DNA sequence: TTTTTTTTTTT
């Protein structure tokens, strides 16, 4: 699951499908920190793994060895297949107040943290920004009087969670909004994501450099041994062919 | 002889070497690379020490083969660390570790000489210090570019505390920077971190093989150099995985002598573990070591047979097909004529591992009374060792082995850490004393 | 994020 780490996730059906109804949380601190955006390069190779953050999240392309090696070789076109395997992944995080969850009725009426993907962020951006001409003025889902809850619906297509069907709803007042204690009761359920944004990011670039080195060898721009990594692929297959040559 | 008359790095170390004895008590490790000639400098410190008459030194080599050639060239006898420290195993079900019987005082040993100090592991490291007395002074030789030990339980930087600043101050060795040697200057670049490049003098040097058919071309070049020569003592091919080596010995065996055999009579093989002649004794039998790990041996007779194994508490005996090869001592060690049972089938090997697990399932919680038949555990477990043919060994298992010509196979290395890949290199390059080819 | 998706090597 995910709840033990403190983050809610969906109880997937046999098809992997799932429906749930939740309301969001505004900004934990005043005039700042409504939400969060996480960047993480994630890949698996040689059985070795890498799942850690990126400092280019705050624009520091330099304090990340996974960022630098791209710019030296421009893998985006130099080796785009290798580029996609390792490229930075953008994670969006927010607090959530659950309303209805038939997959797990215990999850209802409670608040969590959560990470999602970018299409929703465009739709979140598409929902929040509306013109004045379409009568419907823009709406904040976290607004106490104007905000809206939203229902997530996902099906699997070729092993991918698809969300193209998602639709939003009207505004909604939140019941018991005039009680400080009911607010406080839920307010402690709110957590501050800005703490995750402070100086928690690894300052030691050389430490990150060491771990991938243990994860994988080769790939040195000034060393140019990465060509030998290109070359190594041929030899294993060449080894297979020479085995029957016996 | 020449006595005090060498280079600054050679002169500086010995004076500091004396200082550790002379100034307070201190322990030092030296990062001598190859070619820097700290072995030649060590020869003098051998000579200089005899005039003082100190016997507190002990000649220690971590491996038997390094101790053998150390004793052979120097002429002075050296002992194994397992004898020096009486490390005795402890039979448990989950894990098992050789363990020193007691902390000795090491009174007669007032100075300590060690080799290949990178190899000794950190968990063992803490135990040894208490065993070591203050008056004894520790002298260590090793390369930071030498290969580190493998710890399945912990994957970390794990630099040998010999190489960690807090334990004690030490000094590195300078090197004859320039010389008319292509490989070492390439090896200098190898220690620097440049990728391998071919450099040749008089037709001999570092040589590369490139292109689509490079391997087959390198293979015919491999075939060209080797031919049907039965003397590979100076021809050592090295690869990391034993998977690759297994397919090699399969193919390679058929090449030199015209037989399709997994193993044929008359083959030369090397131990992968020491050979103990175990006797049943209270506590732990220290047994008698017959063949050391790394000992070369000549096969006397070769045959593939089967043997039924029966465990008390397990009904009946269980047949396992293996190789029953008889082998004799090859080398300068004590001569012994022996015969071993050895399994060389993946089908049988997984069959072998399964028996252990049922025996593991039953022995960990046995209670029909009594204790447990573990005398039939090791007697059945120790009947078979694991050894591999001479031509190829792992870069781990090729360390120390100085041969004339080395052929190098790189591709499987990417699963290893970067620093290890360079430490394999240094060690790998140092295996070829005369020449090296690289594909 | 659907999930730490490969090695052997020491007494
Ligand atoms: Zn990055």
Author numbering:
A (entry chain A): 24 to 269
B (entry chain C): 1 to 439
What do the study authors state?
Like all SF1B helicases, Dda translocates along one DNA strand in a 5′ to 3′ direction while displacing the other strand. gp32 comprises three domains: the central core region (residues 21–254) interacts with ssDNA, the N-terminal region (B domain, residues 1–20) mediates its cooperative assembly on ssDNA, and the C-terminal region (A domain, residues 255–301) recruits other T4 proteins. gp32 that lacks the N- and C-terminal regions is known as gp32-core, and gp32 that lacks the N-terminal or C-terminal regions is referred to as gp32-B and gp32-A, respectively.
We subsequently obtained higher quality crystals using non-His-tagged gp32 that diffracted to 4.98 Å resolution and identified a second Dda molecule in the structure resulting in two gp32–Dda–dT17 complexes in the asymmetric unit. In one of the complexes in the asymmetric unit, there are 11 visible nucleotides in the bound oligonucleotide that span the Dda and gp32 components; five nucleotides bound to gp32, five bound to Dda–K38A and one at the interface. In the second complex, there are nine visible nucleotides, but these are only bound to the Dda component. The two electron densities are very similar and consistent with an α-helix that engages a surface cavity on the 2A RecA subdomain of Dda comprising helices 2Aα2, 2Aα3 and the loop connecting strand 2Aβ5 and helix 2Aα4. In this final structure of the gp32–Dda–dT17 complex, there was no obvious additional electron density corresponding to residues 271–301 at the very C-terminus of gp32, and they appear to be disordered. Despite the low resolution, the oligonucleotide binding site on the gp32 core domain is unequivocal and comprises Lys28, Lys32, Lys67, Lys71, Trp72, Lys112, Arg138 and Phe183 that engage the five bound nucleotides. In both cases, the electron density is consistent with an α-helix positioned adjacent to the body of the partner gp32 and interacting with the α-helix spanning residues 141–152. In one of the complexes in the crystallographic dimer, the bound oligonucleotide spans the Dda and gp32 components and is consistent with Dda directly ‘feeding’ the ssDNA to the ssDNA-binding site of gp32.
